[PDB]
Design a protein around this motif. Sequence first.
Motif, PDB file in Angstrom:
ATOM      1  N   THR A 220       1.299  -1.292   0.376  1.00  0.00           N
ATOM      2  CA  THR A 220      -0.173   0.266   0.208  1.00  0.00           C
ATOM      3  C   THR A 220       0.984   1.085   0.067  1.00  0.00           C
ATOM      4  O   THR A 220       1.463   1.707   1.458  1.00  0.00           O
ATOM      5  CB  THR A 220      -1.118   0.088   1.202  1.00  0.00           C
ATOM      6  N   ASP A 221       0.490   1.941  -1.581  1.00  0.00           N
ATOM      7  CA  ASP A 221       1.913   3.315  -1.036  1.00  0.00           C
ATOM      8  C   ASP A 221       1.037   4.010  -0.655  1.00  0.00           C
ATOM      9  O   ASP A 221      -0.452   4.591  -0.997  1.00  0.00           O
ATOM     10  CB  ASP A 221       1.714   4.043  -2.953  1.00  0.00           C
ATOM     11  N   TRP A 222       1.480   4.981   0.228  1.00  0.00           N
ATOM     12  CA  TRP A 222       0.837   5.873   1.720  1.00  0.00           C
ATOM     13  C   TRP A 222       0.812   7.141   1.638  1.00  0.00           C
ATOM     14  O   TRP A 222       0.201   8.037   2.076  1.00  0.00           O
ATOM     15  CB  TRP A 222       1.133   5.144   2.844  1.00  0.00           C
ATOM     16  N   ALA A 223       2.076   7.341   0.127  1.00  0.00           N
ATOM     17  CA  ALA A 223       1.920   9.023  -0.750  1.00  0.00           C
ATOM     18  C   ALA A 223      -0.283   9.093  -0.866  1.00  0.00           C
ATOM     19  O   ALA A 223      -0.173  10.024  -1.238  1.00  0.00           O
ATOM     20  CB  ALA A 223       3.124   9.570  -1.417  1.00  0.00           C
ATOM     21  N   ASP A 224      -0.843   8.336  -1.645  1.00  0.00           N
ATOM     22  CA  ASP A 224      -2.342   8.161  -1.839  1.00  0.00           C
ATOM     23  C   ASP A 224      -2.800   6.926  -1.153  1.00  0.00           C
ATOM     24  O   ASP A 224      -2.474   6.027  -2.229  1.00  0.00           O
ATOM     25  CB  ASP A 224      -2.072   8.805  -3.218  1.00  0.00           C
ATOM     26  N   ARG A 225      -3.323   6.700  -0.308  1.00  0.00           N
ATOM     27  CA  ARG A 225      -4.321   5.644  -0.380  1.00  0.00           C
ATOM     28  C   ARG A 225      -5.891   5.347  -0.328  1.00  0.00           C
ATOM     29  O   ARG A 225      -6.169   5.189   0.431  1.00  0.00           O
ATOM     30  CB  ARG A 225      -3.781   5.433   1.478  1.00  0.00           C
ATOM     31  N   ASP A 226      -6.057   6.523  -0.963  1.00  0.00           N
ATOM     32  CA  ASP A 226      -7.813   6.785  -1.265  1.00  0.00           C
ATOM     33  C   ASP A 226      -7.739   6.113  -2.843  1.00  0.00           C
ATOM     34  O   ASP A 226      -9.084   5.398  -2.254  1.00  0.00           O
ATOM     35  CB  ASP A 226      -7.441   8.015  -1.304  1.00  0.00           C
ATOM     36  N   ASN A 227      -7.464   6.332  -3.832  1.00  0.00           N
ATOM     37  CA  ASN A 227      -7.937   6.094  -4.481  1.00  0.00           C
ATOM     38  C   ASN A 227      -7.303   3.883  -5.468  1.00  0.00           C
ATOM     39  O   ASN A 227      -6.434   3.341  -4.737  1.00  0.00           O
ATOM     40  CB  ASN A 227      -7.491   7.072  -6.628  1.00  0.00           C
ATOM     41  N   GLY A 228      -8.542   3.671  -5.585  1.00  0.00           N
ATOM     42  CA  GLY A 228      -8.059   2.228  -6.126  1.00  0.00           C
ATOM     43  C   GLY A 228      -7.611   2.198  -7.697  1.00  0.00           C
ATOM     44  O   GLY A 228      -6.972   0.784  -7.565  1.00  0.00           O
ATOM     45  N   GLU A 229      -7.017   3.192  -8.105  1.00  0.00           N
ATOM     46  CA  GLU A 229      -5.734   2.331  -9.706  1.00  0.00           C
ATOM     47  C   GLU A 229      -4.622   2.399  -8.574  1.00  0.00           C
ATOM     48  O   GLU A 229      -4.297   1.527  -9.037  1.00  0.00           O
ATOM     49  CB  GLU A 229      -5.659   3.893  -9.800  1.00  0.00           C
ATOM     50  N   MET A 230      -4.174   2.973  -7.552  1.00  0.00           N
ATOM     51  CA  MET A 230      -3.050   2.215  -6.978  1.00  0.00           C
ATOM     52  C   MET A 230      -3.760   0.839  -6.546  1.00  0.00           C
ATOM     53  O   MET A 230      -2.383   0.857  -6.245  1.00  0.00           O
ATOM     54  CB  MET A 230      -2.489   3.818  -5.529  1.00  0.00           C
TER      55      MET A 230
END
Lengths: 525, 525, 292, 292
Positions: B362-372
Amino acid sequence: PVVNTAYGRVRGVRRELNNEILGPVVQFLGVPYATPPLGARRFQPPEAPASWPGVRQATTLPPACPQNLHGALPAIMLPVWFTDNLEAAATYVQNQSEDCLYLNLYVPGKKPVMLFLHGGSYMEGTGNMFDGSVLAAYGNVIVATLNYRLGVLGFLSTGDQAAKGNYGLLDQIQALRWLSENIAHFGGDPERITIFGSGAGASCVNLLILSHHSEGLFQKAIAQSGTAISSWSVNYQPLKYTRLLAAKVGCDREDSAEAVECLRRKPSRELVDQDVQPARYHIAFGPVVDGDVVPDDPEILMQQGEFLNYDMLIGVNQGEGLKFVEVSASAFDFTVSNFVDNLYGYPEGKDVLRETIKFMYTDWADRDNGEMRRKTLLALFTDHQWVAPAVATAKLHADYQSPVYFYTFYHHCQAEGRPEWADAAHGDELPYVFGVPMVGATDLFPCNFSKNDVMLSAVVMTYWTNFAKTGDPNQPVPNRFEEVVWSKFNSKEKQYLHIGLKPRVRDNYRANKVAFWLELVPHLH
Amino acid sequence: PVVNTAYGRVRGVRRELNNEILGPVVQFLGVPYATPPLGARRFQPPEAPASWPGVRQATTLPPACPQNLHGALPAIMLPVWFTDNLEAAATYVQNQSEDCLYLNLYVPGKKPVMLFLHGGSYMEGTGNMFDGSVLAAYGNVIVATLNYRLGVLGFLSTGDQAAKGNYGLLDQIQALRWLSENIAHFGGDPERITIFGSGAGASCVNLLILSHHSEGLFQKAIAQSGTAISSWSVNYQPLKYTRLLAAKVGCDREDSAEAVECLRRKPSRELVDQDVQPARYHIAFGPVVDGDVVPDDPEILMQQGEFLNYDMLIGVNQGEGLKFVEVSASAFDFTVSNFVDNLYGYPEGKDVLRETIKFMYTDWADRDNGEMRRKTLLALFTDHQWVAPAVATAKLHADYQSPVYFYTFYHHCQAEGRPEWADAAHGDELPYVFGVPMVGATDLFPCNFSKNDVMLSAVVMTYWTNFAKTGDPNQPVPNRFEEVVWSKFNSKEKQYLHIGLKPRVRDNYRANKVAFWLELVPHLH
Amino acid sequence: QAQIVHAGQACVVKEDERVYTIREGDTLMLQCLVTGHPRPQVRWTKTAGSAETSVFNETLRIERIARTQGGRYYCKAENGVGVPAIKSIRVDVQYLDEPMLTVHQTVRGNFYQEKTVFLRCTVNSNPPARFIWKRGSDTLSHSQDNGVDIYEPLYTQGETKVLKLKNLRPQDYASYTCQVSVRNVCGIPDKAITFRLTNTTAPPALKLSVNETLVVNPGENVTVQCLLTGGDPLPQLQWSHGPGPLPLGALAQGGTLSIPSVQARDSGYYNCTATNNVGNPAKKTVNLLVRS
Amino acid sequence: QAQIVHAGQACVVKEDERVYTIREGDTLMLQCLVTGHPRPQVRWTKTAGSAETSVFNETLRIERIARTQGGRYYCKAENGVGVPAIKSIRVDVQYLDEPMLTVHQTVRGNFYQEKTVFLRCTVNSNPPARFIWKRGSDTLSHSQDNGVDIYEPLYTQGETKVLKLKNLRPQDYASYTCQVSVRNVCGIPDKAITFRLTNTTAPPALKLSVNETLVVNPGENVTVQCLLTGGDPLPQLQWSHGPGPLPLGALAQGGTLSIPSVQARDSGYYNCTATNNVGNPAKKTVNLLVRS
Ligand SMILES: *[C@@H]1O[C@H](CO)[C@@H](O[C@@H]2O[C@H](CO)[C@@H](O)[C@H](O)[C@H]2NC(C)=O)[C@H](O)[C@H]1NC(C)=O
Ligand SMILES: *[C@@H]1O[C@H](CO)[C@@H](O[C@@H]2O[C@H](CO)[C@@H](O)[C@H](O)[C@H]2NC(C)=O)[C@H](O)[C@H]1NC(C)=O
Ligand SMILES: *[C@@H]1O[C@H](CO)[C@@H](O)[C@H](O)[C@H]1NC(C)=O
Ligand SMILES: *[C@@H]1O[C@H](CO)[C@@H](O)[C@H](O)[C@H]1NC(C)=O
Ligand SMILES: *[C@@H]1O[C@H](CO)[C@@H](O)[C@H](O)[C@H]1NC(C)=O
Ligand SMILES: *[C@@H]1O[C@H](CO)[C@@H](O)[C@H](O)[C@H]1NC(C)=O
Ligand SMILES: *[C@@H]1O[C@H](CO)[C@@H](O)[C@H](O)[C@H]1NC(C)=O
Ligand SMILES: *[C@@H]1O[C@H](CO)[C@@H](O)[C@H](O)[C@H]1NC(C)=O
């Protein structure tokens, strides 16, 4: 240079700085802001000071509060310059008396006020080490340095009503009230008061953010490498160490009021010379959750939003915890073991936590040499004690629409045993905050200052004073920092300013490690 | 174009390639290398083929082994081009008979030999899909494509002596012996034989590296996106699924020899049409640990150093497991849950493992969107199934002084639903290995080939053929690849070649994730 | 027409499949049996990497097998009729070396009241060893005396185990024994090692009878003393030179280093180290220099 | 000379320190008491960020307190003599909403024999709720029926809990109930929700009575039907437009969408969704376009 206050008249002294650009200042060294807490007032809140009819001559530094630098210092949590230069620090505390509740003013149309809460470890230090005259003459701000009760005489608590504790914090609140109704005589502004501190002093800053007693006293706050949620921020076993100390001085009575009663008789010299060893990474005497000045656990207070919207400027250095590392794989295993057992209460599952922590802080591109092991230990302590609590505090406060500005100090100052290629350790941001490069290296900060140091010092002083003025660190007064907009901090973007020789604004500092300690480690146990 | 062999005489056919630089080749499609395993020889090792006095006319592709592409394909572990183009693949298997033990030769002074073990999932595929004539005419190497017994008829085992299993692997060994004592008639070199495959075929490659029966048969080996230690590499519950299948075809007898006895009577059509669902990420019929052709667990064999120093060329694509992801946070939690429960045997501590795996990916720099989230799932399956077993195999073999060369394929081929900005999925390296860009897009590989695709295909073909010749992929015959020295691979440096449009040699591929799955996840449970 | 089966009826240890499990140093013998209409060739090959190290007799016999000879073997019948026969065996050569106990106090200041001591035990054994910690005659664990922990650190391949004493109580200053066991797989008995932890247990400290850099003229007599200023278990001292050894130099007692005559060849560093397994070894260097 | 103590003797729930724990909607009243030689000023301030939202009477009374009014309060005596008095209270307003159960089968192919089903329960409660899963009248766990797991996923703030059915046995097709409890802190009773898992349980599928992009002239009558082609628990259907709502449009039944007259304002997307808590909702779009 005589000014009348609500209590008495004070004679200051004007001095010229060791800088051809900076003019003179007026200093008021040693004005009393509270009645001496000597007899019955020991282990008691601070009341208003007395009134003197004549003119008290406050042209000499007041005494420091009772300390003991002889043996057993908390070198882990102390500023590095303090631990390295214990002589140049000990010269500042040769005069110690329990009557130490004084403060010092540095004045260059209501100027802003900036009071500095000095830190360390709650058992030593003094505001006399910080000559705010340079910061005052540069920033167009008044700089104050007080002396609050330290260690036993300042934070002894029983968890009962006999000794609620937090007496030093109450001294800071009393100085805030003093300045609120006396700085106007000095031309200062009681409505633009900003407190700032480093280390334990910044912990005190956040505590006073969460306190009710500081309701109308100040508006802005600056936490430099200090937080209210770290392991050594608050004492959670006050009665334990108070009963240890009481047993040391023949004062062990099973009634808290009687033990406090005999403790008020024993001289301060025989109390401060006692060394009550605390738990690792903890404190034996410090701020406590009295339910009064600290209503509840600071973390609970910040999660429940039970605070006021002060303007906060938080930040951490790159390599704090330099003293923690001064590596074998076996030694790595052992210090991580004591890390887990001490900072997590000997928890069932300490093996899982220990092994996953050793994994998380091991660069696997080279797992052979011990230099990298030293780097990952430095990053370990730096992350757990300073970076993660800072990011958590800035996040929780910024969520409730408190304007927060986050900084990361990367460039440090070059001294003996502190090469410029090493990381900025704990407390190395203070020389630039107090304009030390612009007046020459004092004996306490023997740094090989270069032009870069002076210019960076002017930049950070500009940021801090601008924040004290308008709440935005870059708005009043704007050569590497070109058009850099120190953006705000919120839980969405989490933007921070990277202070140093090569500055930029980045979005997520150590996001994987911060999310590790904050969101994953708790579930482990 | 008639050549005599130790068994009979064969008539080939010369064909010209669809390329003006590449000349003609001689093809021998359908020479028998083993007696048809039809009656008593079903579920039996392959013996030498018969002898024909005349001239057998091997100018047509031999039949594929009995398969079933109608319903229930293992799309997760299958090559992406295979799963997308099931029609252009099904045209290659319209002729299916149990008598399928034939091979195909492609010949341009002893030339090297390169036999291709086709993969997929052990239950489908054929060597007829891979026209090695282009690779032969470019590389100055002979290219062979065989057909080994698939699924039930090729790997059914009982763990007993009734059906040891691994019959398809034994067919591959029989073809290796055939080529060892018959390729000299075609001018080939029995002393420079190299096997190479993708997916399950590369798994078979590593298995034959660990086997005793391949002692004198080949010298070099190439594993492309396939390993012998992955979850679907080896069947560890042969008797279970064999008894399920037996129960399906009315063959459930509590004696293994009797169940095998009735299974030899049932026609192949009614056996291959049965669909025995395996466990998630496993196989129901595949290579097994018979104690003969596979002496013990492949991981134990590689840890104990019980193998010969073949020259290995391993490598993985960037985005294998593309079919695995085709994201909600809840869905992420669920698929990680089934991941842990299936790949780790429903272990006590599945909560710790699941949460720390969700944290690690889980890349925590952005944990919002589902693409990542989709990206981290792709990296999850790609790491656990392909990258980590590949690095572990290359490390264990390289530790015992086996020369290993590691590659990472980053550039893929542009097709419908496969945009060039996406990651190189599983099996997308084959078009460049078999020189597909240089002869036009076949119906099975409908790619929008560009000049970059052709040139990269020539580069990888050059590497592979050079390895087949000298064991160094870059020594015989050396426009982005300028002076790039594909360095060796050892546990110290771990250097790999990044194949793609922008090539370089890097030292540690996904070292944190590989060390996570290899060195930390096991201790968790 | 070529079949092989091998009997393993040698002087090998018993156990209550395909593995030949023998005690180290014992006599190994494996008997390969062939079967062919033509007399087939026998081969006993050890799996060693190659793209004549094999015994061609029906019996593979090794009198004294070490760890190095404990790989995988296989016998093979080369007969022209059909596929050559192959049968493999894993020769598992087991042993149990002697344990090594080392104390580690991990200390500067005495600002905290912790007093934590680690006891690391280390072994080398073909069967992964089982560790039993004892305090005198008391096999201890955390559920028995919660003042201690016991764990096996990762990334050490499981050859070591650590006994943690978190805060030294008066009862902690006792005799601790690491007892390692292979569970008598080859009849190999358990071994043990002991350490006495007391109030004075401390790592070693060294005193040098010369300065750091010792300047000497050619032909002179050099004698350097290595003296002890710390270490409760009596430390052992040794000298060293590094790249090139010196014939003249002698080390009668661990402290005394003697060079009779000096040439420019003798120049360089001379490191005296004291090692008693309590902490980091003590290292004092004599930079012997010869004028030129 | 200014002291304050406040009594909390209101209609507040009982418990067997500084916290005032009341049931939501109940009547709160807090009584601040002052003490001064001069009559001091009283203040009831809620901790709200500021560098007049306060009641200046001795009693802070709120008839109906929601979650929004459950912060921290404090009363203060402003008297010129000495330091003003301050005492704080945490008003903990507790509640327990209704649980939400959703099935999640996570499916393509049927190549593996797994048949795994998840049951996620979700609540909103001031006291972190306790979850009890039942199959009919059987509070189940893993130690009771090992064919199921139960776990609370992280990064969801602990407001949800998942019951996993790893491989559907014939006994798994039953009635599952999520029963959530606040442990009756304010007398609040436990709540429950139920789902029937059967052989036909499936997410919804939608059929559209028009093409994707529907072209219409101004003033015409538009009627679009939303039809169901899947979903064992009877799904519920709803229409939507997005940015700008339409006054003419009506939705008599969840499937029928009606636009009496069409203007270019009415152009855009019209998304019909069917939601029965079994899988992902079904979404079919009608791109209504008006010529111009
Ligand atoms: C004796 O101690 C000296 C320490 O001076 C060792 O010298 C070091 O050797 C390493 C080998 O690469 C160098 O990296 C260090 O810089 C050297 N230290 C110096 C120059 O101060 C020497 O190797 C030791 N000899 C032994 C242990 O035999
Ligand atoms: C109805 O569905 C359409 C799908 O076409 C939604 O349109 C999307 O809106 C988002 C908002 O940023 C865009 O990013 C997508 O590109 C749009 N999809 C397109 C253009 O195909 C629309 O928002 C939905 N309306 C609702 C849910 O009220
Ligand atoms: C500090 O001294 C060193 C050498 O004596 C010099 O190279 C360096 O530039 C100095 N730093 C300054 C003057 O800031
Ligand atoms: C594939 O087609 C697209 C557009 O039709 C084009 O932009 C792209 O360059 C083509 N790729 C080639 C010719 O390799
Ligand atoms: C522990 O050791 C100290 C010296 O280090 C000694 O004075 C003391 O008597 C010892 N305690 C005993 C023997 O119980
Ligand atoms: C050096 O010492 C040795 C033995 O101690 C002795 O034989 C020799 O004569 C000495 N060298 C002199 C005295 O020059
Ligand atoms: C399960 O459902 C299927 C239809 O999906 C039905 O045919 C079968 O009878 C059911 N099993 C029962 C009712 O036991
Ligand atoms: C559209 O439908 C409405 C009600 O269904 C009706 O009143 C109106 O006349 C219709 N529009 C026409 C027929 O143009």
